[PDB]
Amino acid sequence: TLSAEDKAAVERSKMIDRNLREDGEKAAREVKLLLLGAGESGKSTIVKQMTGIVETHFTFKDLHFKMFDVGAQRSERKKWIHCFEGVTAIIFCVALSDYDLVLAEDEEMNRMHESMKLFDSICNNKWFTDTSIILFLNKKDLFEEKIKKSPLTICYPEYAGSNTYEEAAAYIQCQFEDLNKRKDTKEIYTHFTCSTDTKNVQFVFDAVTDVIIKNNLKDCGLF
Amino acid sequence: LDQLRQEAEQLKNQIRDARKACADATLSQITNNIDPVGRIQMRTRRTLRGHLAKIYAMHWGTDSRLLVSASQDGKLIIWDSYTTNKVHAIPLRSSWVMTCAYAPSGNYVACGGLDNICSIYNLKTREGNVRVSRELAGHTGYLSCCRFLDDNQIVTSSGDTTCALWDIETGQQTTTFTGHTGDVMSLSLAPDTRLFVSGACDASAKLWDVREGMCRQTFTGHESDINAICFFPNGNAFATGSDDATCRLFDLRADQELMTYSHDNIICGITSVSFSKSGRLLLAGYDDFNCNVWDALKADRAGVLAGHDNRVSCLGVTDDGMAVATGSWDSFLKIWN
Amino acid sequence: DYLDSIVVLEDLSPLEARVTRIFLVVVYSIVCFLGILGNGLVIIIATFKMKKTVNMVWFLNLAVADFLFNVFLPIHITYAAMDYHWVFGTAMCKISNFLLIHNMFTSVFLLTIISSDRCISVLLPVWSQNHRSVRLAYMACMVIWVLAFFLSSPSLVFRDTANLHGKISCFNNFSLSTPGSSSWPTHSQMDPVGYSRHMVVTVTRFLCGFLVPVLIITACYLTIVCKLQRNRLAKTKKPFKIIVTIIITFFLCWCPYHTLNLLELHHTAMPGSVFSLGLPLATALAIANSCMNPILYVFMGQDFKKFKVALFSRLVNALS
Amino acid sequence: DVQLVESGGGLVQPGGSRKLSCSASGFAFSSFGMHWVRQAPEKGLEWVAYISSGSGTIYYADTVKGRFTISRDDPKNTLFLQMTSLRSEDTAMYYCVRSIYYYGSSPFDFWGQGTTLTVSSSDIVMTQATSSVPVTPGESVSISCRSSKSLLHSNGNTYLYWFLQRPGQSPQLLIYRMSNLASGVPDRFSGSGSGTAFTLTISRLEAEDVGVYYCMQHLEYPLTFGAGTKLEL
Amino acid sequence: ELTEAQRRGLQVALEEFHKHSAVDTPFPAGIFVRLEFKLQQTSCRKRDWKKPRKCLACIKLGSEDKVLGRLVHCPIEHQETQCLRVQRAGEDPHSFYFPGQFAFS
Amino acid sequence: SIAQARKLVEQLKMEANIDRIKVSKAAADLMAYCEAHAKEDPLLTPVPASENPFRE
Ligand SMILES: CC(C)CCC[C@@H](C)[C@H]1CC[C@H]2[C@@H]3CC=C4C[C@@H](O)CC[C@]4(C)[C@H]3CC[C@]12C
Ligand SMILES: CC(C)CCC[C@@H](C)[C@H]1CC[C@H]2[C@@H]3CC=C4C[C@@H](O)CC[C@]4(C)[C@H]3CC[C@]12C
Ligand SMILES: CC(C)CCC[C@@H](C)[C@H]1CC[C@H]2[C@@H]3CC=C4C[C@@H](O)CC[C@]4(C)[C@H]3CC[C@]12C
Ligand SMILES: CC(C)CCC[C@@H](C)[C@H]1CC[C@H]2[C@@H]3CC=C4C[C@@H](O)CC[C@]4(C)[C@H]3CC[C@]12C
Structure with missing residues (x-):
């Protein structure tokens, strides 16, 4: 009931479907990570260690990572955010040497404050309800140098502690990690980067391996 | 010089009062004499599968039989509607794609997305494979919609409050339309291809003349972003879908809002809007995981399409207006009739 | 004149005997119905509303094996119905028993392969990510059907029937001289052939169907639990309550049947009431690991939740 | 620059064997079905063999079915014809034709240059x-x-x-x-x-x-x- | 006809059923007699039926007054086979147990 | 700055001088177009399976 040409068309369609499924299987074994920040908060340096969309593909311990940077797209986060759903993890870079700094805009506003609201918006988004965050804290050395001169209280007019680097950093981490109002489904693997060695990629590798194990357990139905 | 602000107030008030004076009656009162269309039943005569991710765009071909679909997997697929056969499977250089277009002559297709580049592919190449005919750049935001005009002319809309009319051979922006105060999310060309409309993310729609390059009319009334725009077959009216879970019908000559379509049990906005060939039916796609067929002349609801699992991402109607192709983020294209 | 008829002194005892028969055939029928329904639902779910994942092959093959086993069960159920009197002849007793054994061994091997796949998925995530595909699973599953068949091969040949004392029983006769019309002196051995073949078949099935699978399942699930404990990833008590029930039920369902088959090697010194009352219970239990497999693995997944809520709500709307 | 070049012809003693090679250039050979066609020295054209894309479907003419063989080699995009037990009626000129089948396609669009072979001495009509x-x-x-x-x-x-x-x-x-x-x-x-x-x-x-x-x-x-x-x- | 050790008290058993040629297979534990037809038969009697039938009667006699089991229809596969059935009655099962019964395999 | 305000004012002035008609006229035109091209639409009035291309 089929003509000679129609059977050849069906054969071509089946070959196309075969190629599409092979491509889909080959493209599903790469770990995809979104990258977010506030400004030039060490994002370029972090990318160096390891227009529009910027894709970076690298390999660590037989694991292929694709990382998407959306720094250029300034217009509206809400409209393009749903495109990145199901990503393995979200890296969030925060430069914490900015407690004594304000925007180029002459609006009295300390850099982590907008970083805090951006983290709150990203963390509690309905799309990222079970996506782990790998928050990195950058510029540790410059912050340590500055805390001796200008106290941290200029940014947080509630802190009561010594002007030492360790406890100030702990305070900053504590007040950056409470915004997670969904502590039941997602995790915040905080890290103090800018140590200038091959350790940030190791932290990312550990986090993504944990996420992969969790996803496998959810898929098997055992967990 | 604060006087310019008062002057703007003056012309704005004059325009509003002239608009109010022009209106005399409501379309609902005039139309409250015709028989309602009743209750429309539509069945999925065909289901198209083969995508491995969310479907973000779809355009019907020049005929009623071929169509093109784009997925965030990174694939453009050309489907033969009648027999579900796949004619072409173009792999894209960037998987972030949010738009599609089919050339009126059927020789080229268009693609675009988060890469701020409009890629034009040639379908009929003598070597026998689909090639990248052109790559147009110059936008500073994500591409939201691209529509062909001729074989050598395209119109694009970006997320940087800018529409553009290009020239395929030279690859340069022939004309730029600016004036919006937010991201432009939809575009629809007139049947005579002399003018078009754009809806931006500030609750506004604008009418544009292609050759002149200057805006002619602007319509407000929505209370949220505008996600889709369709042009009436008469060419003197259009319909807007918004995130306010509300559709509206505007007319050009009267420059007014005729009807609003909304229900108390709907709380999610529209993502795609398209008329029927007769103009008596308006199909809309919500986030309620189903599509809705209203009655554009009586402002009632007639039909529902709930075949897809996830929400209706893209919706279109055949050129002869018999089948309705609806694609969704759950990687399915349903052909209702 | 013409007298009638009667049957005198036969111990047709209502206690034990008759009532045990009725109760066991009833429970056989109920669990068979539940099993066929469950496996059919599982097949339709894995074929229509479930993607092409590596887990799809395992669940689909398990459902097919369980469905076939439960479809071929009521032939044995109705053999048990008439007080163990085979009225179907030797033509298809071998076929039915072969199909039963083949399906059972396929299901056991599939459970083992599922446990090992889960263990390798949890232990090494990079290797699983890089080297797991549907083609590999499809191949494993066909090798399984073929090996099991080889293991189900010993059936049929011995399956034989006789009308002793007016009753026909379908029994495996390992001394193949019974089809050769050789008699037997009741002293319980045809020494060159009888114990040889009987022992070989019994131990070959017992080992390869109970010893290796239970050890592998226990080791894999204990390793998974230990990994989940040393790195805090549980957040819920569900995985432990699934693993423990799986291990316990596999052991409790597949130990008695195999051990009672093993005891048949010496069916003279042991008493008589043990076999006749014991083998049916092991049959019951056994047939009960093929009505559970469906729930524990694919009716606990995400897709069963989605299909359940969606279709149930839509049919409530149909009620509305 | 999409010429097809064929070789393998010449004078052949009866009962011999030969290989005919069709080398392609300048098009996607992996997506084109290929036909071998024959033309007698003074008569018209006659179809001989056909091979689909991926070698999943092969058809032969009834007059040489079971006598000839066809094959394709995609990496070197070369079409091979095995010719065996040649009779006196196999002297002709052979053409290598391409054809792609989809909705709106144009089969038999391009034809080869032809190679000559000389050998020493239901269906719609x-x-x-x-x-x-x-x-x-x-x-x-x-x-x-x-x-x-x-x-x-x-x-x-x-x-x-x-x-x-x-x-x-x-x-x-x-x-x-x-x-x-x-x-x-x-x-x-x-x-x-x-x-x-x-x-x-x-x-x-x-x-x-x-x-x-x-x-x-x-x-x-x-x-x-x-x-x-x-x-x- | 009759061997004296059987059929003498066994018409007595048959007619205690009335209350409710022949041969014998001597199982090592007891004898199973079949009766088809025998002399001394009488038309009809009351309860004093020993005081002054040609049919199939399967009585596994045993020995003398411990009569093991009887099935006897008298119309003078099912009938004859269930007549043989009584062979089991008064034996110990598992003595002739065939391997592989009662199970899936 | 000031120039953009003047440009916006001028744009409003050009937009304020367009010809306009009554709503009732547009309503009548819409009704006439919808009723005129009504017998052809194979969605308001479904066509039988004889000439339907999609049924099978
Ligand atoms: C004959 C039986 C009893 C032997 C038991 C051991 C078998 C079942 C075990 C040992 C190693 C296991 C394999 C280890 C790794 C993989 C790769 C994965 O992509 C598919 C599953 C697969 C292939 C496992 C299947 C089960 C497996 C083959
Ligand atoms: C005793 C042996 C034979 C048991 C075999 C079953 C299990 C344990 C193992 C060992 C042999 C294995 C298979 C050997 C060969 C093939 C064929 C190949 O195309 C895919 C992998 C596949 C399918 C392997 C997967 C795992 C496997 C099926
Ligand atoms: C007497 C003969 C038929 C017995 C041999 C065993 C039979 C029942 C077995 C052997 C091979 C098996 C098939 C092997 C492969 C597949 C593909 C899989 O996706 C579904 C099950 C299916 C379709 C199996 C069905 C059952 C099967 C046919
Ligand atoms: C054939 C019939 C009788 C089989 C019935 C199997 C029963 C005994 C088994 C199989 C399914 C099992 C349940 C499945 C689901 C749950 C919820 C889980 O969080 C803990 C275990 C628990 C509570 C299980 C308890 C035991 C259970 C009810």
Whole structure:
């Protein structure tokens, strides 16, 4: 009931479907990570260690990572955010040497404050309800140098502690990690980067391996 | 010089009062004499599968039989509607794609997305494979919609409050339309291809003349972003879908809002809007995981399409207006009739 | 004149005997119905509303094996119905028993392969990510059907029937001289052939169907639990309550049947009431690991939740 | 730059064997089905063999079925024909033709240059009664072809093809599906007709159109040709 | 006809059923007699039926007054086979147990 | 700055001088177009399966 040409068309369609499924299987074994920040908060340096969309593909311990940077797209986060759903993890870079700094805009506003609201918006988004965050804290050395001169209280007019680097950093981490109002489904693997060695990629590798194990357990139905 | 602000107030008030004076009656009162269309039943005569991710765009071909679909997997697929056969499977250089277009002559297709580049592919190449005919750049935001005009002319809309009319051979922006105060999310060309409309993310729609390059009319009334725009077959009216879970019908000559379509049990906005060939039916796609067929002349609801699992991402109607192709983020294209 | 008829002194005892028969055939029928329904639902779910994942092959093959086993069960159920009197002849007793054994061994091997796949998925995530595909699973599953068949091969040949004392029983006769019309002196051995073949078949099935699978399942699930404990990833008590029930039920369902088959090697010194009352219970239990497999693995997944809520709500709307 | 070059011909003693090679260049060979066609020294064209894309479907002519073999090698995009036990009727010229099948495609678009082979000494039948017609420049010419079966399928397609062959030149596709013109063909050619009776018309005849015209039955893979109509002087 | 050890008290058993040629297979634990037809038969009697039938009667006699089991229809596969059935009655099962019964395999 | 305000004012002035008609006229035109091209639409009035291309 089929003509000679129609059977050849069906054969071509089946070959196309075969190629599409092979491509889909080959493209599903790469770990995809979104990258977010506030400004030039060490994002370029972090990318160096390891227009529009910027894709970076690298390999660590037989694991292929694709990382998407959306720094250029300034217009509206809400409209393009749903495109990145199901990503393995979200890296969030925060430069914490900015407690004594304000925007180029002459609006009295300390850099982590907008970083805090951006983290709150990203963390509690309905799309990222079970996506782990790998928050990195950058510029540790410059912050340590500055805390001796200008106290941290200029940014947080509630802190009561010594002007030492360790406890100030702990305070900053504590007040950056409470915004997670969904502590039941997602995790915040905080890290103090800018140590200038091959350790940030190791932290990312550990986090993504944990996420992969969790996803496998959810898929098997055992967990 | 604060006087310019008062002057703007003056012309704005004059325009509003002239608009109010022009209106005399409501379309609902005039139309409250015709028989309602009743209750429309539509069945999925065909289901198209083969995508491995969310479907973000779809355009019907020049005929009623071929169509093109784009997925965030990174694939453009050309489907033969009648027999579900796949004619072409173009792999894209960037998987972030949010738009599609089919050339009126059927020789080229268009693609675009988060890469701020409009890629034009040639379908009929003598070597026998689909090639990248052109790559147009110059936008500073994500591409939201691209529509062909001729074989050598395209119109694009970006997320940087800018529409553009290009020239395929030279690859340069022939004309730029600016004036919006937010991201432009939809575009629809007139049947005579002399003018078009754009809806931006500030609750506004604008009418544009292609050759002149200057805006002619602007319509407000929505209370949220505008996600889709369709042009009436008469060419003197259009319909807007918004995130306010509300559709509206505007007319050009009267420059007014005729009807609003909304229900108390709907709380999610529209993502795609398209008329029927007769103009008596308006199909809309919500986030309620189903599509809705209203009655554009009586402002009632007639039909529902709930075949897809996830929400209706893209919706279109055949050129002869018999089948309705609806694609969704759950990687399915349903052909209702 | 013409007298009638009667049957005198036969111990047709209502206690034990008759009532045990009725109760066991009833429970056989109920669990068979539940099993066929469950496996059919599982097949339709894995074929229509479930993607092409590596887990799809395992669940689909398990459902097919369980469905076939439960479809071929009521032939044995109705053999048990008439007080163990085979009225179907030797033509298809071998076929039915072969199909039963083949399906059972396929299901056991599939459970083992599922446990090992889960263990390798949890232990090494990079290797699983890089080297797991549907083609590999499809191949494993066909090798399984073929090996099991080889293991189900010993059936049929011995399956034989006789009308002793007016009753026909379908029994495996390992001394193949019974089809050769050789008699037997009741002293319980045809020494060159009888114990040889009987022992070989019994131990070959017992080992390869109970010893290796239970050890592998226990080791894999204990390793998974230990990994989940040393790195805090549980957040819920569900995985432990699934693993423990799986291990316990596999052991409790597949130990008695195999051990009672093993005891048949010496069916003279042991008493008589043990076999006749014991083998049916092991049959019951056994047939009960093929009505559970469906729930524990694919009716606990995400897709069963989605299909359940969606279709149930839509049919409530149909009620509305 | 999409020429096809074929080799492997020559004088052959009866009962011998040979290999025919069709080397391609400049197109996606992996997506094109390939046909081997034969033309007698004085008779018309005759289909010989066909191989699909991916080598999933192979068809042979009934006269050589089980005697010849076909194959393709995609990485070097080369088509091989194994020829065995040649009789006295196998001396001809062989053409290597490409054809791609999808909705709206144009099969048999390009033809090879042909290689000569000399050997030492149901199916639809398509007829062309008109052996020759004398045509001066500047007239309108009609060519009529007929069938033995209805070429119209239930989907509306009518599988009839029209080819032209100039003297000392490879055949060129003129019309596909009885109504659609091939790429590069001047508009003055046209074709029409109904089942079992088709007609090709040429308007404002020119010096180039001298040659032999053939009709083609693609409803079945035997692919019976016509007797051919000659136009000269 | 009759061997004195059987059929003498066994018409007595048959007619205690009335209350409710022949041969014998001597199983090592007891004898199973079949009766088809025998002399001394009488038309009809009351409860004093020993005081002054030609049919199939399967009585596994045993020995003398411990009569094991009887099935006896008298119309003078099912009938004869269930007549043989009584062979089991008064034996110990598992003595002739065939391997592989009662199970899936 | 000031120039953009003047440009916006001028744009409003050009937009304020367009010809306009009554709503009732547009309503009548819409109704006439919808009723005129009504017998052809194969969605308001479904066509039978004889000439339907999608049924199978
Ligand atoms: C004959 C039986 C009893 C032997 C038991 C051991 C078998 C079942 C175990 C040992 C190692 C296991 C394999 C280890 C790794 C993989 C790769 C994965 O992509 C599919 C599953 C697969 C292939 C496992 C299947 C089960 C497996 C083959
Ligand atoms: C005793 C042996 C034979 C048991 C075999 C079953 C299990 C334990 C193992 C060992 C042999 C294995 C298979 C050997 C060969 C093939 C064929 C190949 O195309 C895919 C992998 C596949 C399918 C392997 C997967 C795992 C496997 C099926
Ligand atoms: C007497 C014969 C038929 C017995 C041999 C065993 C039979 C029942 C077995 C052997 C091979 C098996 C098939 C092997 C492969 C597949 C593909 C899989 O996706 C579904 C099950 C299916 C379709 C199996 C069905 C059952 C099967 C046919
Ligand atoms: C054939 C019939 C009788 C089989 C019935 C199997 C029963 C005994 C088994 C199989 C399914 C099992 C349940 C499945 C689901 C749950 C919820 C889980 O969080 C803990 C275990 C628990 C509570 C299980 C308890 C035991 C259970 C009810």
